[PDB]
Design a protein around this ligand. Structure first.
Ligand SMILES: Nc1ncnc2c1ncn2[C@@H]1O[C@H](C(=O)N2CCN(CC(=O)Nc3cccc4c3CNC4=O)CC2)[C@@H](O)[C@H]1O
Length: 313
């Protein structure tokens, strides 16, 4: 019948037995992300609507505007208690509402939006599609795995053993086409990050830090040629106990070598496309302990791989 042939097509169209490795990765990063929310949310995430988040974000803008104008804390707290009604927290309710809090509350709202959107087609594929990002497992047999393994395990100043469990080929669609390859000097660098950030990184790529009216080369996207340095930023997840790390092609064209720190950099110096923090050496002292590479454009970045690894300790 019409209906049978519909079901038979439905079976075909709705089928993708994508690998365990990729599935387990998706399940983890989402679980780890949800683990962050559950840590500081009285109300379950399922019982928060998208309206609550939109209104919550709307209040932060009013509170931020009011804070800069120097309104009394009476008004600020009155507005903020309305925010906390929509987005309940456990622990403290900061009396001193600084600008730094509002930025983190704004981040939190986005992490809530992720978890709400995804809830909806098995529960594994719903989470994969939600990333809008094409992860593909690379087999240990292939010569691509040995290649990438060595690429990661080259600049290792520290001699701490590294258990490279899984490697995944990753790509975002719009990230590739908008990449500034024409601007030369593209080299593959590493970006460490805690596991709870990964869903957000895969969803929206690496974003520019928000200049609050912390990094020692200003508000840009940092990378390193060394693995030992990227391990420091790639913290172990509470879910699995493993570390995740990105390999990105960073188009950084003209790269100015710096010795002194500079926290006020919103974009690259005039004349250069990027910055290199030169590390402390034998007879060349610097303020940088490790080699930092910083770009201040999202379209100077293009992530290639995700590396799942773990330290002994
Ligand atoms: N879309 C996104 N969703 C969620 N988190 C996202 C994101 N885009 C970036 N991030 C995350 O924001 C964080 C961020 O901006 N930060 C925190 C880190 N800080 C200093 C810094 O980058 N230092 C630094 C220096 C040298 C190497 C490396 C790093 C970090 N990773 C490295 O390999 C600069 C500001 C960062 O940890 C990144 O992973």
């Amino acid at each position: 019948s019409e209906q049978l042939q519909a079901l038979l097509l439905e079976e075909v169209m709705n089928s993708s037995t994508l690998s365990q490795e990729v599935s387990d990765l998706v399940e983890m990063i989402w679980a780890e992300a949800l683990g962050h929310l559950e840590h500081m949310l009285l109300k379950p995430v399922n019982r928060i609507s998208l309206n609550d988040v939109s209104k919550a974000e709307g209040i932060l803008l009013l509170v931020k505007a009011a804070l800069k104008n120097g309104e009394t804390a009476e008004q600020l707290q009155k507005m903020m208690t309305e925010f906390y009604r929509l987005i309940p927290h456990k622990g403290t309710m900061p009396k001193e509402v600084n600008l730094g809090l509002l930025a983190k509350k704004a981040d939190l709202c986005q992490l809530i939006r992720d978890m709400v959107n995804v809830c909806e087609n098995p529960p594994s594929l719903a989470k994969y599609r939600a990333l809008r990002c094409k992860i593909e497992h690379v087999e240990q047999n292939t010569e691509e795995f040995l290649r990438v393994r060595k690429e990661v395990l080259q600049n290792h100043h520290s001699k701490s053993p590294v258990d490279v469990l899984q490697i995944f080929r990753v790509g975002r669609v719009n990230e590739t086409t908008e990449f500034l390859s024409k601007l030369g000097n593209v080299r593959p660098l590493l970006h460490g990050s805690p596991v709870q950030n990964i869903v957000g990184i895969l969803c929206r790529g690496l974003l520019l830090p928000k200049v609050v009216e912390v990094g020692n080369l200003g508000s840009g996207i940092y990378f390193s040629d060394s693995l030992s340095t990227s391990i420091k930023y790639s913290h172990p997840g509470e879910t699995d106990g493993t570390r995740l790390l990105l390999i990105c092609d960073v188009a950084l064209g003209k790269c100015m070598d710096l010795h002194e720190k500079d926290f006020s950099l919103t974009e690259a110096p005039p004349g250069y496309d990027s910055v290199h923090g030169v590390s402390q050496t034998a007879s060349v002292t610097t303020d940088f302990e490790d080699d930092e590479f910083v770009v201040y454009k999202t379209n100077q970045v293009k992530m290639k791989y995700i590396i799942k690894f773990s330290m002994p300790g």
